[PDB]
Enzyme design. Structure first.
Site, PDB file in Angstrom:
ATOM      1  N   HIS A   1     -14.643  -3.705   2.765  1.00  0.00           N
ATOM      2  CA  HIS A   1     -14.933  -5.105   2.454  1.00  0.00           C
ATOM      3  C   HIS A   1     -16.095  -5.598   3.336  1.00  0.00           C
ATOM      4  CE1 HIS A   1     -11.586  -5.960  -0.181  1.00  0.00           C
ATOM      5  NE2 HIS A   1     -10.681  -5.613   0.719  1.00  0.00           N
TER       6      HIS A   1
ATOM      7  N   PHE B   1     -16.038  -4.699  -2.582  1.00  0.00           N
ATOM      8  CA  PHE B   1     -16.155  -3.485  -1.791  1.00  0.00           C
ATOM      9  C   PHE B   1     -17.542  -2.876  -1.931  1.00  0.00           C
ATOM     10  CE2 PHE B   1     -11.458  -3.169  -2.493  1.00  0.00           C
ATOM     11  CZ  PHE B   1     -11.040  -2.852  -1.203  1.00  0.00           C
TER      12      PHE B   1
ATOM     13  N   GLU C   1      -5.664   3.070  -3.480  1.00  0.00           N
ATOM     14  CA  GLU C   1      -6.273   2.785  -2.189  1.00  0.00           C
ATOM     15  C   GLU C   1      -5.235   2.693  -1.080  1.00  0.00           C
ATOM     16  OE1 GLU C   1      -7.407  -1.458  -1.451  1.00  0.00           O
ATOM     17  OE2 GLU C   1      -7.633  -1.452  -3.638  1.00  0.00           O
TER      18      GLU C   1
ATOM     19  N   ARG D   1     -10.794   1.339   3.439  1.00  0.00           N
ATOM     20  CA  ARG D   1      -9.804   2.010   2.602  1.00  0.00           C
ATOM     21  C   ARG D   1     -10.271   3.396   2.193  1.00  0.00           C
ATOM     22  NH1 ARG D   1      -8.034  -2.435   3.930  1.00  0.00           N
ATOM     23  NH2 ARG D   1      -7.662  -4.192   2.500  1.00  0.00           N
TER      24      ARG D   1
ATOM     25  N   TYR E   1       0.847  -1.183   0.000  1.00  0.00           N
ATOM     26  CA  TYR E   1       0.000   0.000   0.000  1.00  0.00           C
ATOM     27  C   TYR E   1       0.891   1.244   0.000  1.00  0.00           C
ATOM     28  CZ  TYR E   1      -3.893  -3.100   1.272  1.00  0.00           C
ATOM     29  OH  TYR E   1      -4.825  -4.114   1.279  1.00  0.00           O
TER      30      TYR E   1
ATOM     31  N   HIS F   1      -1.658   1.167  -3.434  1.00  0.00           N
ATOM     32  CA  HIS F   1      -1.601   0.574  -4.763  1.00  0.00           C
ATOM     33  C   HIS F   1      -2.823   0.980  -5.571  1.00  0.00           C
ATOM     34  CE1 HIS F   1      -4.595  -2.594  -4.114  1.00  0.00           C
ATOM     35  NE2 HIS F   1      -3.980  -2.940  -2.998  1.00  0.00           N
TER      36      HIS F   1
HETATM   37  N1  LIG Z   1     -12.493  -5.709  -5.129  1.00  0.00           N
HETATM   38  C1  LIG Z   1     -11.497  -5.004  -5.663  1.00  0.00           C
HETATM   39  N2  LIG Z   1     -10.221  -5.299  -5.402  1.00  0.00           N
HETATM   40  C2  LIG Z   1      -9.328  -4.524  -6.060  1.00  0.00           C
HETATM   41  C3  LIG Z   1      -9.600  -3.508  -6.930  1.00  0.00           C
HETATM   42  N3  LIG Z   1      -8.445  -2.932  -7.423  1.00  0.00           N
HETATM   43  C4  LIG Z   1      -7.512  -3.620  -6.846  1.00  0.00           C
HETATM   44  N4  LIG Z   1      -7.957  -4.618  -6.005  1.00  0.00           N
HETATM   45  C5  LIG Z   1      -7.113  -5.671  -5.360  1.00  0.00           C
HETATM   46  O1  LIG Z   1      -7.389  -6.772  -6.303  1.00  0.00           O
HETATM   47  C6  LIG Z   1      -7.398  -8.042  -5.614  1.00  0.00           C
HETATM   48  C7  LIG Z   1      -8.790  -8.716  -5.698  1.00  0.00           C
HETATM   49  O2  LIG Z   1      -9.848  -7.991  -5.097  1.00  0.00           O
HETATM   50  C8  LIG Z   1      -7.010  -7.698  -4.207  1.00  0.00           C
HETATM   51  O3  LIG Z   1      -5.578  -7.851  -4.162  1.00  0.00           O
HETATM   52  C9  LIG Z   1      -7.466  -6.223  -4.001  1.00  0.00           C
HETATM   53  O4  LIG Z   1      -6.656  -5.729  -2.911  1.00  0.00           O
HETATM   54  P1  LIG Z   1      -7.040  -4.936  -1.581  1.00  0.00           P
HETATM   55  O5  LIG Z   1      -7.531  -5.927  -0.588  1.00  0.00           O
HETATM   56  O6  LIG Z   1      -5.737  -4.339  -1.218  1.00  0.00           O
HETATM   57  O7  LIG Z   1      -8.073  -4.006  -2.068  1.00  0.00           O
HETATM   58  C10 LIG Z   1     -10.947  -3.199  -7.200  1.00  0.00           C
HETATM   59  O8  LIG Z   1     -11.323  -2.333  -7.962  1.00  0.00           O
HETATM   60  N5  LIG Z   1     -11.856  -3.995  -6.523  1.00  0.00           N
END
Ligand SMILES: Nc1nc2c(ncn2[C@@H]2O[C@H](CO)[C@@H](O)[C@H]2OP(=O)(O)O)c(=O)[nH]1
Ligand SMILES: [Ca+2]
Length: 104
Positions: A92, A100, A58, A77, A38, A40
């Site tokens: 989440h 999300f 995020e 986030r 993070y 990312h």
């Molecule tokens: N659900 C979700 N996850 C994202 C998105 N962009 C990046 N991610 C990351 O993609 C993977 C699948 O969800 C996870 O590693 C999530 O990490 P984070 O838990 O850090 O958000 C997004 O738009 N939606």
């Protein structure tokens, strides 16, 4: 009253700007923290209607009030863009799998 409610977590505007400023600083310097690296890119797979433009990044916001430094990121986030503009606060909690939903 909460400015942002993520499940049972309560955040004020100050909590958000504080978390956001920390994530943006790391983004500017090209550095990451934690195992999920993070801050990312946030791809916006859910398709939220953010008022500001992409790319999005995020950074976790903690209910403890502390700035994220490496442990578990929790479920919440803050989403900010390239110009350090807040896009939204997401979580989440209440979402299936690793999806999300926005904080109310
Ligand atoms: N659900 C979700 N996850 C994202 C998105 N962009 C990046 N991610 C990351 O993609 C993977 C699948 O969800 C996870 O590693 C999530 O990490 P984070 O838990 O850090 O958000 C997004 O738009 N939606
Ligand atoms: Ca607080």
């Amino acid at each position: 009253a909460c400015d942002y409610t993520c499940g049972s977590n309560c955040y004020s505007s100050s909590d958000v700007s504080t978390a956001q400023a920390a994530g943006y600083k790391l983004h500017e310097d090209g550095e990451t923290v934690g195992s999920n690296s993070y801050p990312h890119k946030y791809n916006n797979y859910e398709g939220f209607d953010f008022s500001v433009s992409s790319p999005y990044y995020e950074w976790p916001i903690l209910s403890s009030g502390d700035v994220y430094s490496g442990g578990s990121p929790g479920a919440d986030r803050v989403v900010f863009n390239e110009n350090n503009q807040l896009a939204g606060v997401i979580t989440h909690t209440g979402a299936s799998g690793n999806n999300f939903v926005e904080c109310t």
